[PDB]
């Protein structure tokens, strides 16, 4: 049971802020406050501020110049961390810790920020090949893994998941692609579409078969 727990949804390749802040007001001394941003599972040190001059280099090469706090923000009580170039490889829980020297080196703030990274898939491409009946659907560059649905545009219902063939790919750049091959018996005027849902973004994209 921490002082605060938070989830942060962040886009790949963007700047994100993980908030560790008090109700702002000029009431913190840099020469007094000790701040530690550290990964929660691996316990490695992402960044930190102490009043004495620090050797640095303690930060592994992973976060060295991509994670930063604001000194003016610290003086206002804003110890938030700023990551600069998010990758699906940063999807982990973080932990912020604040101690005071005026106080008994006591914890003024301790928060856990679970960081969920996501990227939006491309608009699906649907093909209409045939057999004695076959549909293929393609989307790329999304995160995390996608769910795919085939929608009957006539009554806005969803076709059964057993009728579709799903295959998930992990490309370079660490994103996800998907191919879904749907097989259904012939009927007059197939009006259907391929829906691809990014669960974390709560976003679905859909294209119909003309």
């Amino acid at each position: 049971g921490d002082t605060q727990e938070k989830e942060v949804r962040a886009m790949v390749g963007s700047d994100v802020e993980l908030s560790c802040a008090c109700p702002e007001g000029s009431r913190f001394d840099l020469n007094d406050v000790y701040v530690y941003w550290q990964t929660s599972e691996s316990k490695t040190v992402v960044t930190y501020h102490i009043p004495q001059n620090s050797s640095l280099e303690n930060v592994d090469s992973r976060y060295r110049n991509r994670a930063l706090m604001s000194p003016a923000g610290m003086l206002r009580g804003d110890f938030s961390l700023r990551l600069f170039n998010v990758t699906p490889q940063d999807e982990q829980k973080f932990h912020c810790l604040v101690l005071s020297q005026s106080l008994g080196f006591q914890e003024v703030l301790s928060v856990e920020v679970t960081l969920h990274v996501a990227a939006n898939f491309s608009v699906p491409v649907v093909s209409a090949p045939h057999s004695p009946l076959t549909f293929t659907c393609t989307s790329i560059n999304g995160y995390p893994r996608p769910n795919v649905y085939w929608i009957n545009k006539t009554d806005n219902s969803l076709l059964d998941q057993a009728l579709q063939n799903d295959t998930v790919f992990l490309n370079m750049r660490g994103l996800y692609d998907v191919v879904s091959v749907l097989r259904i018996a012939r009927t007059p005027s197939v009006n259907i579409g391929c829906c691809i849902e990014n669960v974390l973004l709560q976003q679905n994209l859909t294209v119909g078969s003309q």
Partner: antibody
Amino acid sequence: EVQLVESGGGLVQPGGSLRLSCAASGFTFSSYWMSWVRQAPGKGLEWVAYIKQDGNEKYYVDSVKGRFTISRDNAKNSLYLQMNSLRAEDTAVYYCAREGILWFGDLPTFWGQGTLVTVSS
Amino acid sequence: DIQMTQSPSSLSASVGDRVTITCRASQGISNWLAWYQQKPEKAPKSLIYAASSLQSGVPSRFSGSGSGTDFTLTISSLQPEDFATYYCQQYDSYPRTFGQGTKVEIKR
């Protein structure tokens, strides 16, 4: 406020075993270094052992290596010192302590109250 | 792995006198030294941290000093309550190591 409560001390025969528990409260246990220091009656303060946040890196005293083991449970906020094959030289008061966070110690050591262990026939 | 040499190991000073204790480290420490005071059958009490900064609740007559290898704990005006054993501990690197301790008797 910061509180470190030792337990599990007392009297054990030579060659016996004893496990010391340290219940922590008042700070994020998982984020600090943990340590056991001891003091023999009338003798100075001698550090026993240190453990890092995750628990991979551990440091022991030559007098202790191969016989004691530090463990830590951040889920339950507790630190443990397991002693096996105790000798009379190990009779002392044992303090549980909270150390720094960084690789190069930064925070002053915060001391428990001590529990005392007597190894005697 | 770091060695602390504390001097003297014992001393006697009359009340109101000035007392000085030195602590030398095997290798360079950067103000990462604490000083503790211990009364018999009690746990050690933190007097000073970061070379010369007093902890909350320490009389101002206690003074810290030093940088690099050489450190000093100074009692300005000794008082009949100052009889104790004083230790220096480095927390520059783990394992943190202590000095042998300085016992202080009061001259009367």
